[PDB]
Amino acid sequence: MLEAKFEEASLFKRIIDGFKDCVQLVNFQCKEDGIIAQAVDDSRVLLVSLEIGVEAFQEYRCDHPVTLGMDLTSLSKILRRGNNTDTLTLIADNTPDSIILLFEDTKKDRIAEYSLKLMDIDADFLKIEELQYDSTLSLPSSEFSKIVRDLSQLSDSINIMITKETIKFVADGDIGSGSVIIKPFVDMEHPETSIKLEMDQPVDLTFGAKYLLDIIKGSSLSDRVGIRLSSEAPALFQFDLKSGFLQFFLAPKFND
């Protein structure tokens, strides 16, 4: 068997709301020591990679590595319920027909069991995180979100530029221009709101607004987002889970 018991179905919900809109299928790969899943954009521009470690469950037992390939549309129909507080248990059996999702009452008098028919997806995980990034930058996830949302009103393209202590996001559309400029600093009143920056070489990449919007769906998984930028590789945006992470590797445009 396999028994992933999340304390809060909520968490698993939110994690799927990352992938939810970006992509369309997903191979979960449950190992003896947690789950990994990886979805890729249609146009192959965005990669969503997820790890949940054993610590994130209240119980977790996985005897043999199963791959569960799911339809995201389907899975979010089963999710996203009024019961975001029931103990969701993912349940599956060796050589898996379908994955079972099991939601239980506090008082154990409402047990909504679901059986999601599975999808044979050929497993081809990509390892694309780099050793060294040109610049790495972290800031509250919501700030990133208002930024992305606020600049994406202009064009379909958003330009991040990093220089000595200046993070600068720029958009240019037919309406007119827009630039949001953040500076690194530290704050006591909330530590989880300051802005760290490491600039190993300045950066100037352009990303598509569409995708950046998708990528900020994850601001609800973590108070903070880690952004690693490179000219030689796809940018990595990371939100940290209590025992794992949601990663978006976004590929810059060339000249669109």
Instruction: Collect all residues with Cβ–Cβ distance below 8 Å to 12 and sequence separation of at least 6.
Output: 6, 79, 88, 90
Tokens representing 56?
A: 């994130």
Give the resolution to one decimal, in Å.
3.0
Reference 3, options 27, 34, 25; nearest CA is 34
Exposed e or buried b per residue across 67-77, where buried means at least 16 C-beta atoms within 10 angstroms of its C-beta: bbbbbbeebbe
Distance CA 217, CA 73 (A): 16
Taking CA atoms, 5 is separated from 52, 90, 94, 101, 215, in Å, by: 12, 6, 18, 10, 27
Strand partners, 34: 31, 53
If 0-12 CB within 10 Å is exposed, 13-18 middle and 19+ buried, where does residue 64 land? Answer: exposed
Obtained via which technique? Answer: X-ray
Q: Where are the domains of the chain?
A: 1-256
Q: Where are the alpha helices (DSSP H) in the chain?
A: 9-22, 72-78, 141-151, 209-215
1-256: CATH topology is: Proliferating Cell Nuclear Antigen (3.70.10)
